[PDB]
Amino acid sequence: MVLESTMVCVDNSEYMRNGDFLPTRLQAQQDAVNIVCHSKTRSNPENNVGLITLANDCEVLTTLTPDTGRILSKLHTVQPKGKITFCTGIRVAHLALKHRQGKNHKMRIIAFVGSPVEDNEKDLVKLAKRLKKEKVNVDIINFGEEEVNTEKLTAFVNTLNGKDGTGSHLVTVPPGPSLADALIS
Amino acid sequence: EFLHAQEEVKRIQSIPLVIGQFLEAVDQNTAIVGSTTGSNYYVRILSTIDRELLKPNASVALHKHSNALV
Amino acid sequence: TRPANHRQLTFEEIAKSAKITVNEVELLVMKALSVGLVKGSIDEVDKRVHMTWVQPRVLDLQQIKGMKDRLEFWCTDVKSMEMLVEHQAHDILT
Amino acid sequence: LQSVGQIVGEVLKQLTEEKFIVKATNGPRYVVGCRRQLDKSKLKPGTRV
Amino acid sequence: MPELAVQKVVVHPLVLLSVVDHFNRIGKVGNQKRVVGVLLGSWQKKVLDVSNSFAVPFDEDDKDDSVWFLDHDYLENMYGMFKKVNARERIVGWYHTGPKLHKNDIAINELMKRYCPNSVLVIIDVKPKDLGLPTEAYISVEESKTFEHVTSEIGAEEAEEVGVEHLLRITNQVHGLKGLNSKLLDIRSYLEKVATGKLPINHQIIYQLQDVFNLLPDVSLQEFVKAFYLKTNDQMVVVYLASLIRSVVALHNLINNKIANRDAEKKEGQEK
Amino acid sequence: AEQVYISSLALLKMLKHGRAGVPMEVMGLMLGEFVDDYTVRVIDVFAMPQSGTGVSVEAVDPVFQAKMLDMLKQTGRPEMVVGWYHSHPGFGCWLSGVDINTQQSFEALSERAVAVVVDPIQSVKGKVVIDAFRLINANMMVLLNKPSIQALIHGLNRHYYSITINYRKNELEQKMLLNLHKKYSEHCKHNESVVKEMLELAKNYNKAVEEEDKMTPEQLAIKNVGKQDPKRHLEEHVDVLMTSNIVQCLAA
Amino acid sequence: LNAKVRLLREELQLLQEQGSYVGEVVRAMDKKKVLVKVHPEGKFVVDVDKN
Structure with a gap:
C-alpha cells in the first residue's frame, strides 16, 4: 500500500516441512509471500522487499530489490531445517533497514512464525523500546504456537504499542490446515 | 641541487628513437654522423657517455626531431 | 639454569644413575641415537657424549620467572651499541 | 576511415621487454614499444609484426 | 638478501593510499568501525600481486558482534563492471584495519573463501604501529583461525613508481632493539597472566624460548661464542689487510689529479 | 584565470x-x-x-x-x-x-x-x-x-x-x-642482509683482487701519452671497490 | 661550485634543435657565395657567414 521497504522473514525450520498444513507448511507460506509482494508492488513500483531468515542461523538472503523472482527461487531450493533464532533476526533486519540498496521508504517487517518461539521477555521488551525510538513496525503472522505453545507474542505487540505506528498487528491462525486467504490479512 | 639537474637530462629524449651510425667525432661534443635514412648531419651529443670508447662501426640511436646522439 | 656452557657429559655419571655398566651405555646411546631421542655425537677420546638438546620440558613455571630477568639484560646491551652509532654521522652504504 | 594505418615490420631482435628493434617503412630503422595488452607467448624470435 | 616465500604478496603503493582516502572520506569514522574492503588484483603461478581494491560498505552493531550487515550483491555487480574494464583483475582477498582481530573476521572470511580458496587478509594501519612496514598480510583458513607470515613487499608498475616519487646499519639497529622490547613486554605479560589465572598455558611459547637462549647472540656477549671467536679474528685481520692496500692505491690517483691542476694553474697566472 | x-x-x-x-x-x-x-x-x-x-x-x-x-x-x-x-x-x-x-x-x-x-x-x-x-x-x-x-x-x-x-x-x-622503502619484514630483512654478505666473502675477495691487477699497467702506459676515456674509468672503478669492502667489514 | 650548477640547467633548455647538413665545397666564388654539392642531395649556391 504505502511507500515502504519490507524485510521479509521466512521461517525455515523442521516444523515447516510437516503435514499439519495441506500440503506442506513451506508451500502454504510460499503462496502468501507471493500475494503480498504482488499487491504492494502493484500499488507503486517504488516498493522494496529484502528477505531474511528467522531460523537456522540468521542470514540476509537479499537486500532491497523490487523483484519477485529472487524471492520465489530461494523457497524452491529449500528443504527447511533449523531452530528458532527470533531475537537476532529482529536485530539483523533492523540494521539492514537503516541503509538501503533501494529507496527512501518507511520500515516494516512482515514475518511468518510457524514455530514455537520462547523468549526472554525482559530483554525483548528493551529491544521493543529501542525499535520504538527509530519508529519500526513489525507484523507477525503466527500459527504453530497457539495450541502447542504460548502466546508471548501478544505481549510483544502490546509492549511496542503506545501509538498505532508501533501498535503493529498479530495475525493468529490455528496450527491445523490453513491456506493463505486468511494468512494475507 | 646538482643531483636533481642530472635526473632531468636522461628523460628529455626517450623512445621511440631513430638509428644512425657514427661517422666520426669532429671535436669535443661534436660529431659527424651519417643517418641510415642516408642523410648525414653534424650533431650535438650530451655529456654523460664516453667519447673514445665509441667504435667507428658502432650504430647509434639519435633523436629524430633534434638529431642528437641519445 | 644459565645458558649452555657445554653439553659434554661422560658415561660414568650416567651409567651409575642408569645402573647399567660402562659397556652398556655405549650400546644404549647408540640405540637411542638411531631413534633420534638422542641428538648428539660420540667422542671416543675421553669416552664422553656431546649432547645436543631438543627436550620438550613441558611446564617450566620457575624457569620462566628467571627468563624474564635475562631477556631484560639483553635489551640493554644492544641499546648501548645503538647510542654510539647515533652519535657519529649517518650510515649510508653509498 | 577514422581508423589508423598499419605499417609492416619485422623484428630484428628483442632488446628489453619494452624495447624491440624494427626496421619500418614510414621511415628507417627504429627502436619501438609494444602494447601492454599483448602476450609474452607472442614474443617469438624473428617474426613479422 | 630480501625475504621471499612460497606464496608471496606484493601490494602496490596505490592500493594502500586508497585505504587512507577511504577512511577520511566515508566520514562514518568517529564511530570507530572496522574499515573493510575487498581486494582485487593479479595472480599467476604463486604470486598475489595486489593490483586493485575497492571499498565495500558495512555496518556492524556497536553492542553485538553477531549482528553485522553486508551485501553480496554489491560485490557481484561491481565485479562485473571491473571485468568489463580490465579482465586482468581477479579477486585476491580482503582488508581489515586491525589493530586487533575479531571473531567476525572469521565471518567475512567464509564468504571470500568460496570465491577462491586463498583469501589474503591484510592488516593495514596508517597510524604507525611499526616504524618499518606498517602493513602485515596473513592468509587464513579455519581449522582454529590460521595466519601466515607471508612476505609483504612493495613492487610496482612503471607509472605507479614515478607518482610516488613526485609526491616526495643504524636503521637496522633501532629496529633490532624494537623487536627485543616487543617480546619483553610479552614475558611480563605472561607472568602477570599466570599469576592471575588467565588462559595462557600454551606449551609452544616456553619451548621456543629455551632453544634460543642456548645459542646466545654474538654481536653482544662472549659466553658461548668464545671458542668460535678464536677463528674469527684471523679472518677479519685478513680483510683489513686488503683494505689497507687499496687506500694507498686511491691516494695515488688523487696525486695525479693535483699535479695536473697545479701545472695548469701555475702556467696560467694562477686563478682557481 | x-x-x-x-x-x-x-x-x-x-x-x-x-x-x-x-x-x-x-x-x-x-x-x-x-x-x-x-x-x-x-x-x-x-x-x-x-x-x-x-x-x-x-x-x-x-x-x-x-x-x-x-x-x-x-x-x-x-x-x-x-x-x-x-x-x-x-x-x-x-x-x-x-x-x-x-x-x-x-x-x-x-x-x-x-x-x-x-x-x-x-x-x-x-x-x-x-x-x-x-x-x-x-x-x-x-x-x-x-x-x-x-x-x-x-x-x-x-x-x-x-x-x-x-x-x-x-x-x-x-x-x-x-615507509614504503626503509634503508614487520623489514626488521628481519635488515638483519639478514648483514649476515649473507659474510659467507660470500671468500668469492668476493677473489673477483675484487682480479680487477686491480688489470688496471695498473694501464695507467702507467697512459701516463706517457695524452689522456683518454678508459684511464679515468679504470681509476674510478677501483674507488668503488674499496667502499664495498667496508660494508662487509661493517657487518660484524 | 655554484657556476657548475648553472651550467647544468642551461643545457636542458638548448637541446631542442634541428641540425646541419654535411656538404663538400666544390669551389668558392667572389659573389661571396660558395657552390656545394650535398651528398644525397643536390648542389646549391649558398651565402657565406659573418665569421
Missing part, C-alpha cells in the same frame, strides 16, 4: 588506467567540487567503457555512469561530475576538431567543464606530462593594438586554451610513502 586542483591519490589512478589503454583513447568522468569558477577540486574519477575506434560524442553510456554514482553514493562519497578526461598519447597535447565537438556537448550540459588530458606514452619520461584544457570563453581571455584584441577574443570562440595544473598535498598520504 583558473586553477584545477588534482588529488594526490588521483594522479596515480589516472596514470594506471591510461597506460593499460595504450595507445587507444581512454576517457572517464571527473568528480569533485566547484567553489566559485576560480577553483576546481578533483576528488575522484571513474572510467567508462573502452573503445578501439576512439572516443565519440555518442560514446557515452547513460546506464553505466548512473549506476556507478549510486554505488559511490552508497559508500558515502557522492559528488557531481566537474568535467571529463580524454587521452592523447603522442597525438599532440593540442585537441583535435573532433574533441572540440565532444567538448561542446558536455559544456551544453554544464556551465563549464574541464578537459584533462594525459599523454601516458610521454608519461614514461619519469616526471609528469599532464595538460588541462578549456575553451576560449572570454571574461578573462580579454584581460598588437588595443581595440583589436578585445574584439578578436569576442568574435572567435572555441580555440585551445590550456590552463594550470596543480595539486594539494595531504599529510597522511605523505607519511605513508616514506
